[PDB]
Amino acid sequence: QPLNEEFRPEMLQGKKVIVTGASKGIGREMAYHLAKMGAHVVVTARSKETLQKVVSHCLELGAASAHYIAGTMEDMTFAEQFVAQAGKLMGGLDMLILNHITNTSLNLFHDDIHHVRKSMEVNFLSYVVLTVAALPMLKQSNGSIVVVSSLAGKVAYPMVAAYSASKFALDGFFSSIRKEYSVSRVNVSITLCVLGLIDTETAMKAVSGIVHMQAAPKEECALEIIKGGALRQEEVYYDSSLWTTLLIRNPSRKILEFLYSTSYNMDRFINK
Amino acid sequence: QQPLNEEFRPEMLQGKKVIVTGASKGIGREMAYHLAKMGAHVVVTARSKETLQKVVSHCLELGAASAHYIAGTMEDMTFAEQFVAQAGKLMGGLDMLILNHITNTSLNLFHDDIHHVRKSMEVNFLSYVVLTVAALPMLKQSNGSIVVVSSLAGKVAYPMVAAYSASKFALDGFFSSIRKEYSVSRVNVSITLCVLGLIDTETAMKAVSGIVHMQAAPKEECALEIIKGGALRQEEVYYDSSLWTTLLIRNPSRKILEFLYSTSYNMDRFIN
Ligand SMILES: NC(=O)c1ccc[n+]([C@@H]2O[C@H](COP(=O)([O-])OP(=O)(O)OC[C@H]3O[C@@H](n4cnc5c(N)ncnc54)[C@H](OP(=O)(O)O)[C@@H]3O)[C@@H](O)[C@H]2O)c1
Ligand SMILES: NC(=O)c1ccc[n+]([C@@H]2O[C@H](COP(=O)([O-])OP(=O)(O)OC[C@H]3O[C@@H](n4cnc5c(N)ncnc54)[C@H](OP(=O)(O)O)[C@@H]3O)[C@@H](O)[C@H]2O)c1
Ligand SMILES: C[C@](O)(c1ccc(C(=O)N(C2CC2)[C@H]2CC[C@](CCC(N)=O)(c3ccccc3)CC2)cc1)C(F)(F)F
Ligand SMILES: C[C@](O)(c1ccc(C(=O)N(C2CC2)[C@H]2CC[C@](CCC(N)=O)(c3ccccc3)CC2)cc1)C(F)(F)F
């Protein structure tokens, strides 16, 4: 259930926001847009130094306030405590942007069970832990959770098997709890972001000299994420391909969820 | 992946070497039985030792070429790995790996139980990956098949089954991706993903007792349909008691989209 109007930057002014994986790439881009909009930001990642750079530019850009707390989202204790500390720094929370992933490479799957588990722990499970911890704050602000996923969390590509497992898991979990928030009247929005290849240094280094589809700009990607999030959209799509509309516009899933969503809808085609 | 264009006939399994997990009860047990009637060699597994022994007996009675059981929990990755080697030895190889077991769950709103989420991912998903890695060399030898049992709720969202849907979405992501890897690497092992609606197994029927519109499909037919899809090397089996649902759950447009992505570079240019 989105917000009616069109996006205005004014919407984030004074809002209290967490961005994870925000020392590099898209997370850093998002932090910068949030700063320019005059939000309070807490950013996180493992690296002390790179987070400081981002904090400094955020303040320069006009952020109501800016802070960083460092640590690995492999540590579910850290994840849980991080949201607590970040909520103290800002006096509440309006938007939780879940963006970090564990380092991965483009490669055939062979037998790296430990990579599959780590991808699942860092890319999926840590997001559930951060959500549980943030939810009381979000409940009292009528806030928003933004979950960064990928085209590879909607369709199958080779070379990203463990990664794709974890992005699909995000769709299943968060789309399910969105249905639960709706039956339990929890006014917290959940936005799933489905991104094409984006020109972050990590990705551009991986695809160097291999044949692949155009990368889209990270800066606009980051604004489009914040906009869909602020507007409380269920999904945000950002990529460069003409083909992607085949995914975006397929209404089958929405039709099925609708058919099964009430006893009255199931009564159309199913005996009581 | 190429489906065999021959019609299904019971003889396709006679003397074939087949694993079935989750076979002490429900669909799994039904599958073991069907495979017995076809004269396959079966190794069955689950945690319930005395129920499995019973299952092995009725199997032999129905005409299984050989029938053994090894008991253990798929919470334990070591055991998953162990189970496959030992089951191979018992049969002289492996033609089909049928992955069917899930960890217990109930129909409830998710609150804060990260541990049940993790355990779901470990058992319903990570174990399936361990079993596959352990099975692959033998399935290469035989040009065999991997069958992965999943659910409507691994394709669309439902409330009350969040951790469970995460694990089932994860299976789609992982196995659909390694299927693309197997086509480009020319590995001749098929991957069939089965998408089931509500089935009339005792676990499910208990959990939905007294709930309205709970139309279940018969587990006996369900089990046959999975075996056929596996045997015919189909990419997906769709099985539900509603005709509408069975039609609407097809997603050929994702498969076309996947092809387009695999044959595009730069601004949607064709590689060939
Ligand atoms: N770039 C693409 O082509 C693309 C496409 C589709 C979707 N996405 C999605 O967009 C999001 C951001 O991607 P990106 O390419 O911008 O990534 P990135 O630039 O490589 O940055 C990843 C961020 O996560 C942090 N990180 C890595 N491991 C961590 C850990 N264990 N604990 C805490 N933080 C950790 C990194 O900082 P530290 O190393 O210091 O911890 C960094 O801040 C991801 O969710 C990704 O799936 C990207
Ligand atoms: N029933 C439905 O309405 C429905 C719908 C869609 C999809 N499915 C799928 O169909 C498959 C089977 O479902 P079902 O209804 O037949 O299930 P079930 O009757 O409840 O039995 C599940 C099987 O998994 C085994 N199992 C449980 N925990 C285990 C563990 N830790 N390690 C190893 N095995 C374990 C159980 O045996 P033990 O207790 O002896 O270990 C049992 O044999 C599942 O993958 C499920 O997701 C079912
Ligand atoms: C972590 C990482 O930065 C990463 C970046 C993005 C993604 C991802 O989400 N995408 C999905 C959104 C499209 C991948 C898909 C595979 C890809 C596109 C293939 C094509 N058809 O265009 C490809 C695979 C193999 C070779 C070359 C390209 C590259 C992009 C995953 C990991 C890495 F790993 F370091 F790069
Ligand atoms: C383990 C278990 O036996 C189980 C059985 C099946 C499934 C499953 O895969 N299905 C998907 C295939 C359809 C569920 C989805 C939710 C469901 C359908 C909702 C509706 N509108 O039809 C429902 C939710 C809430 C209340 C009542 C029903 C029941 C069926 C998951 C777990 C349990 F948990 F013990 F039951």
Q: Can you give a write-up of this model?
A:
Two copies of one chain form a homodimer. With 272 residues, chain A is an alpha/beta fold. Chain A has a single domain, classed as Rossmann fold. The first copy, chain A, is 48% helix and 14% strand. Chain A is built from ten helices and seven strands. In chain A, strands 3-2-1-4-5-6-7 form a seven-stranded parallel β-sheet, with helices on both faces. In chain A, helix 2 links the parallel strand 2 and strand 3. In chain A, helix 1 crosses helix 7. The longest helix of chain A has 29 residues. Bound molecules: NADP nicotinamide-adenine-dinucleotide phosphate (NAP) (2 copies) and ligand 3PJ (2 copies).
Task: Briefly say what this structure is.
Chain A: It is an enzyme of class 1 (oxidoreductase). With 272 residues, chain A is α/β, with parallel strands linked by helices. The first copy, chain A, has 10 helices and 7 strands.
**SSE run of chain A:** EHEHEHEHEHEHHEHHH
Sheet/helix structural class of chain A: alpha/beta
The helix content of chain A, as a percent range, equals 40-55%
Oligomeric state of this protein? homodimer
Largest sheet of chain A: 7 strands, parallel
Number of domains of chain A: 1
Q: How does the overall form of chain A come out from the CA principal axes? A: globular
In angstroms, what is the radius of gyration of chain A? 19 Å
Which CATH architecture of chain A?
3-Layer(aba) Sandwich
Assign the CATH superfamily of chain A: NAD(P)-binding Rossmann-like Domain
Cofactors and ligands: NADP nicotinamide-adenine-dinucleotide phosphate, the ligand C[C@](O)(c1ccc(C(=O)N(C2CC2)[C@H]2CC[C@](CCC(N)=O)(c3ccccc3)CC2)cc1)C(F)(F)F
N→C terminal distance of chain A: 29 Å
Placed side by side, the strands forming the largest sheet of chain A appear as 3-2-1-4-5-6-7
Beta-strand residue fraction of chain A: 5-15%
Number of strands of chain A: 7
Largest interface: A-B, 70 and 68 residues
Helical segment count of chain A: 10
CATH top level assignment of chain A: Alpha Beta
